[PDB]
Design a protein around this ligand. Structure first.
Ligand SMILES: Nc1nc2c(ncn2[C@@H]2O[C@H](COP(=O)(O)OP(=O)(O)O)[C@@H](O)[C@H]2O)c(=O)[nH]1
Ligand SMILES: Nc1nc2c(ncn2[C@@H]2O[C@H](COP(=O)(O)OP(=O)(O)O)[C@@H](O)[C@H]2O)c(=O)[nH]1
Lengths: 427, 153, 36, 427
C-alpha cells in the first residue's frame, strides 16, 4: 500500500506511457479488457500499487494523460490496450501545442491547469496511502517541457512530502528534432532542479546505438525504443510489487544516491540485452550481468561516464540468486576501476535483490548511477543557448506570449551554477 | 660478543646507506629530464589532417587560390586542437612514469630491511644463548661454593 | 650489547613545449634559375 | 588453468591461424561447429587453456582476428571453419593495407587500436588465470608489421608480467614477395626487441627446402608449409595441456634459454619428418629423433648454426619413452660437437618429456635454440636497407604518412648494436 499516481504529458509521454502499460499488464496478468487471468497468487498480492478495482473483476490503472491537442490521445485508444484507461482521465486542450515552452506554460497551461489538478486530486485521494507521483515527459518539446513543469510546481506545493519521480528525454547532440530546444531545455531545467526529487535522463541516440550494436535490429522503430525504457520504469518499482531478499524502494534510492539537494540527475542502463545470434555463445551468470551494466556502451544517456567520476551507483538484480555472488561483484567492480570513483565516499555501489524476474528471462538487472559526466550535456545546451541568445534569435515568439527576458537570465544563471557545482565536488 | 655488535653495525650502516645513495641516484636523473619537448614519435598527425593538406596542395597547384585560403584557415585550426591533446597525453604519461618508477625503489627498501632484521634476530639468538650458559654455570659454582660453606657458615 | 635496526631513507605538466607537426610536401618550385 | 589468448594479424597471420586451429581442434577431438566428438577423457582435463565454453556444449576459441582490409577475413568465413569463431572477434578496417609499415602504424593503426584492445579486455579478463598472449604475424607486410607491433606495445603497458610470445616470419633473402621489405623489417625489429619476451623466427625458404628435401613433396602449397609451423606452435604448449613425467611450460623455457633480456630471437625445428613413402622402413626411436633435430637442414630458419655458436638449446619430447634414453642424448650431442657450444655455460641443453603425442605419431620431438648464427639473418636485410636508403626516394611513401627520416636511423642503429652484442658473447 504505497500507491503511485502516473502522469503522461505530450506526444512523447503518451506513446511511452501506452507501451508502459502493455509491459505491466502482461507482467501482472491482466487481459486487455481489464480482467485477471493470471497463473500465480503473487501477482494479485500488490497490484494495488498501480491499479484500482472496479466492482466486477475489472482493474483500472492510475493513469492521467495530458496533452494540448488530442491528436496523439486518439492514436493511443485505437491501440490494443487503449480501452483499459478510464475515459475521464483523458485531459486535453483544443489548441495547438506550438512546440513553444512559454505558450505551453502561460497561454494554454493555465486553462488546463485548473482541470488537470482535480483529476490528479481524485486519484491522489482515493487510496489508503500515497508514496509519490510518476511523470513521463520530454524536454525538447513545448507540451511536455512546458505544461509538464507547471504541474510539477502545483504538485510540490500541495504534496511536499511525496516523491515526485520524473523521467525525461534529453535533446540529442548530433541530430535533434527541434530548432528551439536550447530555449526549451534551458528553461525546463530551472523548474526541474528546484521542484523534482529524482530525474532520469534518456537520450534517443544512445537508444539507436544500443539497438544497432547489441540487438542487431536492422530497422529499429519507436516501439522497440520505447520498449527499452519501459523495463527501467518496470525495474525500479519492482521492489514495491514483489517480495525480495533485500528491499529497496524509491525513497531508499534517493537517500543513498543523492549527496546534495541539487545533484540528482541520473543515468540508467538495462542488462541483459542479448543479440539475436550471440545468445548461443552467452552463458547467463551473475558476473555476466555485471559486465553489461557498467559497460559504457550500455548506458542509455550519451554522456560518457569515463570522462567523469562517479558519486554513487546502484544495481538492482531480479530473480532467485545467490546473495554472496551479488555482493562480491560490487566489491570487485569497485576495486578494479578505482580511478572513476570519489575517495571521500567509500562503498559507492548500492545493491538490492528482488525475487520475481521479467517473463522469459530467468535473471535480469537494472542500473542507476550519478556522475559528474553530466557536465557534458549541460555545457552542450548552454553553448547552443548563448549563440541563439547573443543575437536575438527566435526569442520574439516567446516574448509575445508574455514571458519576460529576465526569465532566461535566471534560467541560464541557475543552469550555469549547476555546472560549477558538479565541477567543485570532483575535487 | 659486544664487539660483534659493532661489526654488525658497521656492516649494516655501510650497506644501508650504500643503497640509499643509489636509490636517490636513479630518481635524481629521471625526474629532471626534458619535459618541454614532444619527441618525433608524438608528432604524427591525424589522417583527417592528411587529406586537408593533400587537397590544399591541388587547390594551390590548380591556381585556385581563393579557396585554398579557407582550407589553410581550417588546417591551422585543426592542428591547435590536436597539438594540445598530444601535449596532454605525453605530460600525463611522463608524470605517471616517474610515479611508477619511484614506487619501485621504496618496495626494495621494504624488502631490504627484512634481510637485516632477521639476520640480527639470528645474531641476537646466538647472543643470548652463550652468555646465559656462561652465567648459568658460574652461578651454580658460586652457589656450590656457598653450599659447601653452609656446612660451617 | 645488542644489535640495532638502522632506518633507511625513502626516496618518495605545463603544456608549454617546443615541438610542432612534421615537414609536409609542398607544391611551390625551388628552381628560380630556370623559372625567374 | 594457464589460459592463453590468441591474436592473428594480417593475411599471413590469418592463414597460419586458420590452419593452426584445425590442428588443435583435431588434437582435442573438436568438431568444426564446436562440439566434442572426441575419443578420450584426457582431452577434457585442461581444454580451458584455448577454448571458452558456451552453454550448449559448444567450444569457442580465445581468438581475435585482425586485418586492415576485409578480403582475408571473408576467406575464413566462407572456409570450412567459418562458424567456430565468435562473430565479435572479427575486427577489420575499410582501407587498403597499403603494404606500408608507417601507414599501418600511425594512420590506420590508431583507429583500430582502441577497438582491438577492448576485445582483448573481454578475453583477457574472462578467465581465472592468464599466463600470456600469443601473436602471429609477418614482418615484411604492412598490417602485421605495422599494426602488429603497435598492439604489442599496448599489451606490454597493460599486462607487464604476462608472456608475450610471438611467431614471426622474416623476409626471404633470395626471392621475396615484396619490394619495400628492408624498410618494413628494420622498423619492426626495433619495436620487437624492447617489447616481446620471446620471438620465434621462421623463413619461407627453409620450408620450401625442408618439404622438397625430406617430405619429398613435388608441389608444396601454403597448406602444407603452414602445417610445419603449426606443429611447432602446438608442441611448445603441449606441456600445459597434458600430464607428463617432467613438465616445462613457456616461462621455464624463457628462463633457461634467455641469458640476457635482449638476446631472445630463436630458431625452431621439428622431428620426425620422413617421406610419405619411406616412413614404413624407418625405425623411429629416441636416438633417431636427436639426429634430425640438431641437423642443420631441419632448421625452420635459414641461418646455418655451424657458422655461429650455440648459447642455449631446448628440446621437448612427447610420448611414452625412457627418461634415461633422453638424458643420454643430451650428454652425447653436447659432448660430441663441443666446438658448437659456449664454454662459459655448462649444460646448455634443456630437456622435457610429455606423455601424449600428436595423432599418427608414436613419438615426436621439438627443438628451440638461441645462437649467434642470427647475425646472418640481420646482415642481409641491413645491407639491402642500406643499399635502398642511399636513395631516399622510396622514403617519400613513408614521409607522406608522418614518419621522419631520423626514425630510420634510430631503428638501424638499435638493430646494429644487437648484432655486435651477439658477436661479443661468442667469445
Ligand atoms: N523515445 C521516443 N521519443 C519520442 C517519441 N516521439 C517523439 N519523441 C521525441 O520527443 C521529442 C519532443 O517531442 P514533442 O513532439 O515536442 O512532444 P510534445 O511535448 O508533446 O510537444 C522529439 O525530439 C522526439 O525525438 C517516441 O515515441 N519515443
Ligand atoms: N608461410 C606463410 N607465409 C605467408 C602466408 N601468407 C602470406 N605469407 C607471407 O606474408 C608476406 C606478406 O604478407 P602480406 O600480404 O603483406 O600480409 P600483411 O602483413 O597483412 O600486409 C609474404 O612474404 C608471404 O610470403 C602463409 O599462409 N604462409
Amino acid at each position: 500500500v504505497r500507491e503511485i499516481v502516473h502522469i503522461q504529458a505530450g506526444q512523447c509521454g503518451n506513446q511511452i506511457g501506452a507501451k508502459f502499460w502493455e509491459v505491466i499488464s502482461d507482467e501482472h496478468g491482466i487481459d486487455p479488457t481489464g480482467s485477471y487471468h493470471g497463473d500465480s497468487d503473487l501477482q494479485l498480492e500488490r497490484i494495488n500499487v498501480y491499479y484500482n478495482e472496479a466492482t466486477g473483476g475489472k482493474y483500472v490503472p492510475r493513469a492521467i494523460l495530458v496533452d494540448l491537442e488530442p491528436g496523439t490521445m486518439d492514436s493511443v485508444r485505437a491501440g490494443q490496450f487503449g480501452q483499459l484507461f478510464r475515459p475521464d482521465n483523458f485531459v486535453f486542450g483544443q489548441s495547438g501545442a506550438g512546440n513553444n515552452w512559454a505558450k505551453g506554460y502561460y497561454t494554454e497551461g493555465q486553462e488546463l491547469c485548473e482541470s488537470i489538478l482535480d483529476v490528479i486530486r481524485k486519484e491522489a485521494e482515493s487510496c489508503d496511502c500515497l508514496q509519490g507521483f510518476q511523470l513521463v515527459h520530454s524536454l525538447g518539446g513545448g507540451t511536455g517541457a512546458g505544461l509538464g513543469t507547471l504541474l510539477l510546481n502545483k504538485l510540490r506545493e500541495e504534496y511536499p512530502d511525496r516523491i515526485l519521480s520524473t523521467y525525461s528525454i534529453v535533446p540529442s547532440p548530433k541530430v535533434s528534432d527541434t530548432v528551439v530546444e536550447p530555449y526549451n531545455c534551458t528553461l525546463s531545467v530551472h523548474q526541474l532542479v528546484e521542484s523534482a526529487d529524482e530525474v532520469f535522463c534518456i537520450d534517443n541516440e544512445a537508444l539507436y546505438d544500443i539497438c544497432f550494436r547489441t540487438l542487431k535490429l536492422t530497422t529499429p522503430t519507436y516501439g522497440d525504443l520505447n520498449h527499452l525504457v519501459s523495463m527501467v520504469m518496470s525495474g525500479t518499482t519492482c521492489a514495491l510489487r514483489f517480495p525480495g531478499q533485500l528491499n529497496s524502494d524509491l525513497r531508499k534510492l534517493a537517500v543513498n544516491l543523492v549527496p546534495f539537494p541539487r545533484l540528482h540527475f541520473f543515468i540508467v542502463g538495462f542488462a541483459p540485452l542479448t543479440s539475436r545470434g550471440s545468445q548461443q555463445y552467452r552463458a547467463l551468470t551473475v558476473p555476466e550481468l555485471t559486465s553489461q551494466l557498467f559497460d559504457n556502451k550500455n548506458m542509455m544517456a550519451a554522456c560518457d561516464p569515463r570522462r567523469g567520476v562517479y558519486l554513487t551507483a546502484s544495481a538492482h538484480f531480479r530473480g532467485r540468486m545467490s546473495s554472496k555472488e551479488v555482493d562480491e561483484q560490487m566489491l570487485n567492480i569497485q576495486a578494479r576501476n578505482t580511478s572513476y570513483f570519489v575517495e571521500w565516499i567509500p562503498s559507492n555501489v548500492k545493491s538490492a535483490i528482488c525475487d520475481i524476474p521479467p517473463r522469459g528471462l530467468k535473471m535480469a538487472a537494472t542500473f542507476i548511477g550519478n556522475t559528474t559526466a553530466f557536465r557534458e550535456l549541460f555545457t552542450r545546451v548552454d553553448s547552443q543557448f548563448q549563440k541563439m541568445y547573443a543575437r536575438r534569435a527566435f526569442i520574439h515568439w516567446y516574448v509575445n506570449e508574455g514571458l519576460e527576458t529576465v526569465e532566461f537570465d535566471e534560467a541560464r544563471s541557475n543552469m550555469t551554477d549547476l555546472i560549477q557545482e558538479y565541477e567543485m565536488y570532483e575535487t | 660478543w659486544n664487539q660483534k655488535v659493532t661489526d654488525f653495525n658497521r656492516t649494516q650502516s655501510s650497506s644501508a646507506r650504500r643503497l640509499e645513495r643509489t636509490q636517490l641516484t636513479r630518481l635524481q636523473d629521471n625526474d629532471s629530464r626534458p619535459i618541454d619537448e614532444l619527441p618525433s614519435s608524438y608528432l604524427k598527425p591525424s589522417p583527417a589532417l592528411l587529406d586537408l593538406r593533400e587537397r590544399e596542395r591541388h587547390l594551390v597547384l590548380t591556381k585556385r587560390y581563393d579557396e585554398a585560403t579557407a582550407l589553410h584557415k581550417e588546417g591551422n585550426k585543426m592542428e591547435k586542437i590536436e597539438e594540445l591533446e598530444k601535449k596532454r597525453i605525453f605530460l600525463q604519461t611522463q608524470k605517471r612514469q616517474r610515479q611508477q618508477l619511484l614506487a619501485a625503489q621504496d618496495r626494495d627498501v621494504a624488502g631490504f630491511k627484512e634481510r637485516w632484521m632477521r639476520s640480527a634476530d639470528k645474531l641476537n639468538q646466538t647472543m643470548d644463548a652463550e652468555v646465559a650458559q656462561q652465567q648459568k654455570i658460574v652461578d651454580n659454582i658460586r652457589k656450590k661454593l656457598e653450599d659447601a660453606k653452609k656446612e660451617a657458615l | 650489547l645488542r644489535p640495532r635496526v638502522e632506518v633507511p631513507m625513502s626516496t618518495s605538466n605545463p603544456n608549454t613545449v617546443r615541438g610542432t607537426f612534421p615537414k609536409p610536401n609542398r607544391p611551390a618550385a625551388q628552381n628560380p634559375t630556370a623559372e625567374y
